[PDB]
Design a protein around this ligand. Structure first.
Ligand SMILES: CCc1csc(-c2cnc[nH]2)n1
Ligand SMILES: CCc1csc(-c2cnc[nH]2)n1
Lengths: 348, 348, 348, 348, 348
């Protein structure tokens, strides 16, 4: 019994779509959905998507309000569509997937993920919803998240953090660490051994280890001394070189956060989406040092130290492939006389 | 002698409409009003209303720039239209009322509030403007604000704060506390005895009493001890319970402000408008505790303590009606064995 | 070989237009440019200009990413168009000039600034680009910036600061202080002796002299005592009078910054553009003191003290013309009994 | 080497996309594509589709300019996508199919119809294009059109008419009658015995038989006499009853054309699309007789006479299923005392 | 005293801008200008231009309502701007020129054509307006139209027809044949000897000579016999060959008009603008013969016969340049054994 007025009634009264009966008067003007509240129009939704306004409004209302995997993890695992839910991409203000299964009549390709249209697509299943572990078992392609063990299925322990309504958090009152499962062409796939990005912000960065606490507190030359990092180009890679017109290094989010406390800088997110490695056009406000494409990754400093120290430093240049967030991230390792010159998430 | 170019000349030269003669070249592109300043277009206004762009621009230029009652107070008092002014709703970026009286030819229903079209509408009158106290006396319906006494009219002392250009403040250089008067069907109405919401922000919250100072400084168990609040469920109602998947209580703005200093949280204002009780889809970033509809009221902690302590705690559940901002706010009081379990502004 | 898809490929892969070959799939919906990234549309640009979306996108991609003069300086020097570059106006989110020379086929009036269409326009030339000092010599009208000396040309030392990608900064890793040259009707013009505005922000204001350090630290009556400013109305002009309904003085940005640390205020930028003197509709949140048109200039306090102390204080009212950012700024000097009453950048 | 500017160059110089090299300056304003021609913008395309303006422009430029099957035939045969062409729907001013194969990077699901994504879709193959008869032979699902015979495959002779650039015509200088072949799950189908709609216009109707010539040239009572149609309700079904408030019958396009020659009428095409049976809200201007849903079919009068005369007239009401344009069209047959009362394409 | 409301008052009351005082309430919604007429909005103008809606509305209201030269003639003569008028391009629904002189504050480059900005532009002068013949005399670049003679200046007799409000006509109650004068760099030009296009419509074509009357009234083989046109390929060029998939010839509008009377056809005007030679994607509805780019010129049949008979027919292929509407039109002449094969306005 789906309608624009019922979706709007649910938003107004329940904070989101909750399947409740009722209608509120709605008006659509260009890309905005309004509702009449005591004679005046009140904005309920501004369409920032490439879908029609009323369609995007319904998908946003019907978004998953439980902690769900971050869009970067879902993309890295090849997810095409979700089963009977909408994963809302808060970084793009749009649905994470083009089509739906049993959500909205305009975007639905099927009502149930058992329909043959879904067979070639990697469907996302949520083990916390009844019957979805079985739907994954019957799916030709898919990604499954669970809170516990599935008999017979070998699990992948995912990241500690999940996205609850656009807030990336490591749950205390809710479970955010899931078991991951993937199927390609009817066959369960062994998910690789992987590092996870920490999903932290530059402005509200918090250290998640004693090495990270020591990086933000200690001076450059004494941190490198304490952690035996001499010859690993941390001065360039992690700390950043702001002495020339082109900003040198600065590829770890912790280094950007340390720099940010002393002096601010402009990070231009020219491709605004969730991804394991982010690209920014950075301009340091203090020195005027800048870089058009500065690739930044948020790894735990210990994980980055482990990656760089596990590399052979005897060649001039080579690609170093590291599994991060289930995807293979190519890095460019540049050495000279047995020491690192640079190490950066390779620009493609 | 009203024109788009004259309204724009006034905005450019006077900061708002000031009745000054002159014209500036204007260009309208979609919902934005631009003006040519030395060969380049400069944005003067972006239409966020459901009115035509040039009409919304004129009403915004013709907005009341004196401290006026907050839109929630005007709505609670049943105001439909203002007399010869525009009350700009800064929370909605739109006029507070659909039609005008003697303001804009496109939105005007009348030139003077004495026209019979205005008789059934509650017209807002400003006693600070010449002849408006008399216009209220002649109005069939209306709300009047004054700075002093009106002979014969029994006043209602309003809130200490008013809105000056979207800034809610308690005036020191201007008067913000008004006398309130209301008329329904030619008859002056006795405005009820009322509490007032404090209109504070979460991010720049300031305590307005020694009890409020003690709430933000003292620990939970010693504040409740000092103010004899044992058995009144302040731990749930005011402090908030962040231990379960559903966020418990957290219905007073002071409690949200105390929580905000320690850890941040997302408050989704899904119905963005001015109102006595606000509804937020809250997500606690620390714990992942969340609630789709968390009703929040900004009462002075002393006023809330007075309301909860003036209740009979012998029944399981009952509606407790409290007059706040001239409106009757229904609360849901839940008790057990003579103690409060919960008390919240009842969701309708 | 210019295309929308190639401009988008360059934005996606290089952070801006870099002349690289390649195409990415693009979709245009209303005023937004999107690109397909793994099956979902990602926003690359939102058109805030009065130009067509694809045209504004190309000019933004083709923007000058080197430290360039601030748009206010270029406007004050009468610049109409830039030679083979786009000066992006980050204060207006639009190109600083209507037409281009050798940049975009839609906005180009010429391919080279030597074309007779450019002769009557003041073309901006960048001495850091090969052949542009010669193009200035051949131009009938123009403004030239250089890093060093041009044989025979008498230079004007410009401001210490320039705009690098919208960040106004005094360069340490890049050069931001240029030599300025201007030509009117084939004849090189002597640029006047000038003060420069400091281009600081209210929220991140930093003192650039011991007088500025003393202004923000010392109390009003002891700063005026230390710097012998008795009788110069600094209490009104610089500190601001918040005792009446109309906010008195407050015309220097340092005074606004000092006030801002104690109590916040709303500054309404009703003409949002870069300019030597800015106009704000200010509302003091603490007192409710307000002014529709409060002209603010960011001069170094020492430069403002020098200007006010170099004035004859024997007449009631007179216009005081001061050269700031190469433009003549008219001030209104009001005196009484040999003392300053007020001194403000005269509202036109 | 696809670009918006190259698609526009092709439109401007070749009348459509012809793979020619070159670029013209383009500007996009809302849903319109313009090109600069001697300093002024000239409209090239107005987007009437739900696709982005630049995407719809490219698909329209890349439309099939050879006589192709009418969209109703393709829909009736279950065609989902075309192989390496765009079937433009001139009745909807939009592409006939959502996705493309080897046409536009934004809408392409595959480059070649041999990709596994196309296997479950009924792909349209044109035997006039080299290798497409062989692509149909290897495809799991698909519809093939040919001018001549295919080895082994028995054809289904299609309609005499095809659509050449939106003009439905029976070709004299081009071939418009095709052989149809269909494959479902790898098996060549035996297409059903079918009547074809004649695809004529009301305003330029031409008779295609001596019975049709006699219907237009003769009076009602003598045509029915000559063709022994007494008792078949042609007076109601074909001629129309304009004597009551509800317009009676009028379900054959020839009858509407006969009526149109005498007096005009408004046909409201409330679902504007190509389809075997059309629905119109008709209002007769002469009498004021009207019908909200008047289903109209354009059958050759001889074919309609054959259908109605091949029915059992002994029951009050029954569904009569007829294969028209390869689809099953349900009709409603209403009889009384062995005579037809009405016979109309069933409103479902 | 220019305003949007005054321009709208003039449109509503005078049918166009007539300088009358007064204002009507206006509302702008996207690209449409509305006015309130008795409580309901009535559409006054729909913007089909690339200019802002209110700017295009004012230029349309301020359009020249006297018979003016057709936009193709003005373009061919190199006119850039008009002096104190707006030449409205009814074929593009937009102003014929980008900028104005003394018309609209948004589009004006100057108030009087004597300003130095106008010196390098070819300004259009109308001798019917007081002092414009003298303004042409003093202007460096410009085109002058006059009804009668100018002292000293030898005229160029223009076409018999002019455009009166979008209606191309040969005036009987008004003068439509003008004397043309042109000046380049201060020197009066000798305008070339030229043929004129007749500017006729396909649907309402009228013969303007006994040869044209005979072309329409006679059969192909007897017209060619009467006018000794054997060997000049009129059967192909003028009559059209509809026997093959590609429509042969059909380059004269009289031939299209003759064909149109027998059977209809679709002419797709893919570059909709006024021009001496027009290009159409033609589809013949009777035969299905079609051509993507069919160049059509409307010459008087006698003028076309004179052009083709004044050509040397001894080479296989050559460009034949003919002055039509003051511009040089290249034709492609194809011969074989001394006879014409084809002759068409060269597709460049
Ligand atoms: C609808 C009027 C009409 C069109 S064609 C036609 C006719 C031609 N030959 C016999 N009849 N009558
Ligand atoms: C195209 C049909 C037509 C129009 S005018 C015309 C004619 C008039 N006098 C001779 N012939 N024939």
């Amino acid at each position: 019994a789906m309608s624009l007025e019922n979706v709007a009634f649910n938003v107004v009264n329940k904070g989101h779509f909750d399947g409740q009966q009722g209608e509120v008067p709605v008006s659509i003007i260009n890309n905005t959905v309004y509702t009449k509240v005591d004679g005046v129009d009140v904005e309920l939704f501004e369409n920032k998507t490439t879908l029609p306004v009323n369609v995007a409004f319904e998908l946003w209302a019907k978004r998953n309000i439980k902690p769900v995997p971050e869009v970067k993890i879902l993309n890295n695992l090849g997810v095409d569509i979700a089963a009977n839910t909408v994963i809302w991409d808060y970084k793009r203000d749009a649905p994470a997937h083009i089509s739906t299964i049993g959500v909205c009549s305009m975007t639905d390709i099927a009502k149930k993920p058992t329909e043959t249209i879904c067979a070639p697509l990697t469907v996302f299943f949520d083990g916390r919803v009844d019957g979805q572990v079985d739907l994954f078992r019957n799916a030709r392609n898919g990604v499954l998240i669970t809170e516990g063990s599935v008999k017979g299925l070998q699990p992948s322990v995912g990241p500690k953090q999940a996205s609850l309504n656009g807030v990336t958090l490591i749950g205390e009152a809710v479970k955010t660490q899931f078991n991951y499962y993937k199927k390609v062409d009817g066959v369960v796939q062994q998910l690789p051994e992987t590092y996870f990005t920490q999903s932290r912000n530059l402005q509200e960065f918090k250290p998640r280890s004693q090495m990270e606490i020591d990086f933000l507190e200690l001076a450059m030359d004494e941190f490198i001394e304490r952690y035996k990092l001499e010859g690993y180009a941390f001065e360039h890679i992690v700390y950043g070189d702001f002495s020339h017109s082109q900003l040198g290094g600065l590829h770890l989010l912790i280094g950007l956060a340390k720099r940010f406390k002393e002096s601010p800088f402009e990070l231009e997110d020219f491709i605004p989406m969730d991804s394991t490695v982010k690209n920014y056009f950075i301009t340091d406000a203090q020195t005027g040092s800048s870089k058009c494409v500065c690739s930044v990754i948020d790894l735990l400093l210990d994980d980055f130290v482990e990656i760089i120290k596990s590399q052979d430093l005897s060649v001039v240049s080579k690609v170093v492939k590291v599994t991060i967030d289930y995807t293979e991230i190519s890095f460019m390792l540049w050495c000279k006389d047995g020491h690192v010159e640079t190490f950066y998430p390779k620009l493609q």
